[PDB]
Design a protein around this nucleic acid. Sequence first.
RNA 1: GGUGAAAAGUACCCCGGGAGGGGAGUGAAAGAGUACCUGAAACCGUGCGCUUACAAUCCGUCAGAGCCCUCGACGUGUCGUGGGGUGAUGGCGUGCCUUUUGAAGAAUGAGCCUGCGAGUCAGGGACAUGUCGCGAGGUUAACCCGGGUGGGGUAGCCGC
RNA 2: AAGUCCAAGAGUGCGGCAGUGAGACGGCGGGGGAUAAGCUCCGUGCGUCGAGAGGGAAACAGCCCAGAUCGCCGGCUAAG
RNA 3: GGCAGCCAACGUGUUGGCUGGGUAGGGGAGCGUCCUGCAUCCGGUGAAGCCGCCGAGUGAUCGAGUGGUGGAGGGUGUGG
Lengths: 209, 124, 49, 114, 100
Amino acid sequence: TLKVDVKTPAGKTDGSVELPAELFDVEPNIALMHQVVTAQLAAKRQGTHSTKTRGEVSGGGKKPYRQKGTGRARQGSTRAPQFTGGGTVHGPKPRDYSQRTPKKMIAAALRGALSDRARNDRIHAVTELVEGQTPSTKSAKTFLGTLTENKKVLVVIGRTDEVGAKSVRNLPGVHVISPDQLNTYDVLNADDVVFSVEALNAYISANSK
Amino acid sequence: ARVKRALNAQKKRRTVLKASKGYRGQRSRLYRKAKEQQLHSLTYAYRDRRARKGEFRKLWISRINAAARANDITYNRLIQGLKAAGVEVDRKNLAELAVSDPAAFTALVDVARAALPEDVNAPS
Amino acid sequence: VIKLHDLKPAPGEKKAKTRVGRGEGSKGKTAGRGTKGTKARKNVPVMFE
Amino acid sequence: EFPSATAKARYVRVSATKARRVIDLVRGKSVEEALDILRWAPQAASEPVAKVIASAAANAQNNEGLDPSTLVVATVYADEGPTAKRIRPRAQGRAFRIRKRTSHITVIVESRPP
Amino acid sequence: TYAIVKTGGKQYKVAAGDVVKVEKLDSEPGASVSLPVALVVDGANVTSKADDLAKVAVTAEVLEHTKGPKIRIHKFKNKTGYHKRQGHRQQLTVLKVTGI
RNA sequence: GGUGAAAAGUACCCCGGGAGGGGAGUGAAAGAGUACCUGAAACCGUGCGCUUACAAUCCGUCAGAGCCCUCGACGUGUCGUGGGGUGAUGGCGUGCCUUUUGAAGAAUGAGCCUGCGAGUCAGGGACAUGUCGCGAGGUUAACCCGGGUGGGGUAGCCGC
RNA sequence: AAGUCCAAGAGUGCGGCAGUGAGACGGCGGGGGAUAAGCUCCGUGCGUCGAGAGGGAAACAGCCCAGAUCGCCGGCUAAG
RNA sequence: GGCAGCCAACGUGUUGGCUGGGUAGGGGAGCGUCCUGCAUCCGGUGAAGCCGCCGAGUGAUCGAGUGGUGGAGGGUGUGG
Ligand SMILES: [Mg+2]
Ligand SMILES: [Mg+2]
Ligand SMILES: [Mg+2]
Ligand SMILES: [Mg+2]
Ligand SMILES: [Mg+2]
Ligand SMILES: [Mg+2]
Ligand SMILES: [Mg+2]
Ligand SMILES: [Mg+2]
Ligand SMILES: [Mg+2]
Ligand SMILES: [Mg+2]
Ligand SMILES: [Mg+2]
Ligand SMILES: [Mg+2]
Ligand SMILES: [Mg+2]
Ligand SMILES: [Mg+2]
Ligand SMILES: [Mg+2]
Ligand SMILES: [Mg+2]
Ligand SMILES: [Mg+2]
Ligand SMILES: [Mg+2]
Ligand SMILES: [Mg+2]
Ligand SMILES: [Mg+2]
Ligand SMILES: [Mg+2]
Ligand SMILES: [Mg+2]
Ligand SMILES: [Mg+2]
Ligand SMILES: [Mg+2]
Ligand SMILES: [Mg+2]
Ligand SMILES: [Mg+2]
Ligand SMILES: [Mg+2]
Ligand SMILES: [Mg+2]
Ligand SMILES: [Mg+2]
Ligand SMILES: [Mg+2]
Ligand SMILES: [Mg+2]
Ligand SMILES: [Mg+2]
Ligand SMILES: [Mg+2]
Ligand SMILES: [Mg+2]
Ligand SMILES: [Mg+2]
Ligand SMILES: [Mg+2]
Ligand SMILES: [Mg+2]
Ligand SMILES: [Mg+2]
Ligand SMILES: [Mg+2]
Ligand SMILES: [Mg+2]
Ligand SMILES: [Mg+2]
Ligand SMILES: [Mg+2]
Ligand SMILES: [Mg+2]
Ligand SMILES: [Mg+2]
Ligand SMILES: [Mg+2]
Ligand SMILES: [Mg+2]
Ligand SMILES: [Mg+2]
Ligand SMILES: [Mg+2]
Ligand SMILES: [Mg+2]
Ligand SMILES: [Mg+2]
Ligand SMILES: [Mg+2]
Ligand SMILES: [Mg+2]
Ligand SMILES: [Mg+2]
Ligand SMILES: [Mg+2]
Ligand SMILES: [Mg+2]
Ligand SMILES: [Mg+2]
Ligand SMILES: [Mg+2]
Ligand SMILES: [Mg+2]
Ligand SMILES: [Mg+2]
Ligand SMILES: [Mg+2]
Ligand SMILES: [Mg+2]
Ligand SMILES: [Mg+2]
Ligand SMILES: [Mg+2]
Ligand SMILES: [Mg+2]
Ligand SMILES: [Mg+2]
């Protein structure tokens, strides 16, 4: 039920945005969103790790020597695991690491993280990052500094607004994401989440029905 | 994620080899033979830690018996009389008395003989 | 403000895997299989009597 | 302590244990006595070790500038060096290994008082 | 003179000033404990009767609390695969005896 | 496979037939010298400390004289809540692992060190048990839109 | 009917995970053998070894005593 | 005198009582190695590795205690 003031790059405010409590006042669920972020990073894991088993390494077809009478260990090929240059036994092969959590688990984790930010006044709405027609990291940085003192911020902007995302892209602690792409991992990174009026309205309207 | 198992492997090696110093032969040089010796060493240390309390009681009894027989009394009658008299000094300090000052041992033998039956072979 | 390092699995969720054949302290030299036989190296089908 | 001079001869084509067998003759002796003993001793490993001793003496001649006759071979030893491996073919197709061994002879001499 | 104190289920020969490492006693360092006696030798005469041995106690002061030697146990039985490691350090108190 | 930041890769002198070194120089370093980062263990020496040539030793462990070193105190060499090294001597003491009713076994395997060498992974698989979400419902598969891990997708599947 | 009952860590039922299915000697009851075997085959709310350390039997898995949580330079005992 | 497992009492961390040999095997809780999300800290005024000294823990082991060597990366917390 929070009422976040919308703030303009001039240092002023225009109005306020109502945050529905079914969407920004949810009790957080540490275990649930632990599972959600762990599944997220599992999907990010490029599992491109591979070895060669006993039969994939080069050579090894021959039996190295006679099986009896030589006074030596019985050896079936030179590519056996115990050999130098031999095959790896239970070694890595490529894996897909994504796991498919239910939709409402993901949605609830989103709402819980955003509620966690809202309870502590870490959600901001702004008309836009910088006055348009041209990117400017200097002025957008100054405005964002007035807006917050913390290190990491999410900057949730609509996809069409390129001048804004360009002017905030090169700040070291700033992460830019689209409202329809919002996930629990990026909002838990951020100390503050800085919406735009359009992006806040868009996220509200995508969950208003 | 391949591990090179040598950082962890060497730790117990250094422990056992440092414990095996002074061992004659290759039981102080090679981790395997030193480990085999450490097995016996710690079992033997347990065994002898338990039996040291019996070895020392043996030694105290032997010293007490010699001192008692110098005082013209048997060991068994001496401790029977000390039990009868209520004097309740253990064999350790009774051996320190036998060695260090024999006059107190003589007096204590006197007490033990005074507190002893007029017939030790009597049917009672 | 919960951050990514404040996340923790629910108590009782994650159990440790039983790594077998890694010493005589836990399960070694047979990995819970006992001595020889058919069952010491492969299996028996469930429809075998 | 006494003033000292050093000489090292490395990768000498002599087994270490065959160098030590004549090194043990001359340890802790005057340089001239050691050189004589090596010159009349009938083992070939004397040729390297003798040279090494003489070399050390020259260092005290020319770098410490101390008296020739006070020199004593205080420390002398022979370390192992790299080994080359060869093969000698034997009966019925066997092939045995051969080691060509080497040595490092080290000498420190001191100018002790008479 | 010198007595034989009873403490910790053990008997120690003691004379004034002697320092003895006994089993753990509940007394903060600096405090004085009093201990019973199993025998007293004064010059050439000893106190062995039970009633008048109970009349005299040895007064000592606690200097510190100590850990005994580190003992390492590795139980082992051959051909069975049975090992069992553990360690033990014994807790002790150091007593400086003052009077008898 | 690995000198060094850079060859600045050791001019000149001395011993040696050379190889190799010793001075001198280069360099932050030569415990970096084109045998070159770090330089472990096995294995091989040299120096010192204690011990050992009337003695039947799974090679240790427990008790222990003598000697040697070190830390305190008083003092000026002898104790002390001491610590190390070595050990004359005394008690006890039948390697490890496999496999066996039972092996120190004269059953197997192992010369030594260092590196390596064995319950892993896939699957809406099956069963059981934790944990989480929703709950008489639960969930989507292919697929479609997202530079992402996000959002749609009711076909089916399980319960009823 | 009681006993044990801050324990036997006891029964029974359902389930998850097993290993085992080569036993040995000793006491008592027996078959086979020659009323031989350190033989072989059975019975035993019999024991110990297996899977058991410690004490005794000179040494000596299976016999007698006794079941090792650790420490102590305390005491009392068991078989002997 | 120290530890631990089961249970009980007041009560909410203590105390007490019982118990703690063990192979196949079952269960529980942990040590050390490496890679990583996030968070912090250390490091050419010298990281790692190695060699020691002096210590520590019930065990695997530890030493953000110290020296020698060394020359560029490491520690710790909480998850994967
Ligand atoms: Mg092939
Ligand atoms: Mg052979
Ligand atoms: Mg084949
Ligand atoms: Mg390969
Ligand atoms: Mg989806
Ligand atoms: Mg020794
Ligand atoms: Mg897994
Ligand atoms: Mg094994
Ligand atoms: Mg199993
Ligand atoms: Mg097997
Ligand atoms: Mg079998
Ligand atoms: Mg089986
Ligand atoms: Mg089948
Ligand atoms: Mg000659
Ligand atoms: Mg031929
Ligand atoms: Mg050969
Ligand atoms: Mg046995
Ligand atoms: Mg066995
Ligand atoms: Mg086992
Ligand atoms: Mg210079
Ligand atoms: Mg350097
Ligand atoms: Mg080399
Ligand atoms: Mg090097
Ligand atoms: Mg002699
Ligand atoms: Mg004999
Ligand atoms: Mg001995
Ligand atoms: Mg013996
Ligand atoms: Mg066989
Ligand atoms: Mg066998
Ligand atoms: Mg047999
Ligand atoms: Mg053998
Ligand atoms: Mg033999
Ligand atoms: Mg066989
Ligand atoms: Mg062999
Ligand atoms: Mg290999
Ligand atoms: Mg699977
Ligand atoms: Mg009953
Ligand atoms: Mg019980
Ligand atoms: Mg039961
Ligand atoms: Mg069968
Ligand atoms: Mg059968
Ligand atoms: Mg049977
Ligand atoms: Mg039989
Ligand atoms: Mg019979
Ligand atoms: Mg019969
Ligand atoms: Mg029979
Ligand atoms: Mg029977
Ligand atoms: Mg068996
Ligand atoms: Mg027994
Ligand atoms: Mg039994
Ligand atoms: Mg009987
Ligand atoms: Mg008695
Ligand atoms: Mg009797
Ligand atoms: Mg308790
Ligand atoms: Mg147990
Ligand atoms: Mg018990
Ligand atoms: Mg087991
Ligand atoms: Mg580490
Ligand atoms: Mg981490
Ligand atoms: Mg820094
Ligand atoms: Mg520097
Ligand atoms: Mg690393
Ligand atoms: Mg340094
Ligand atoms: Mg260092
Ligand atoms: Mg982990």
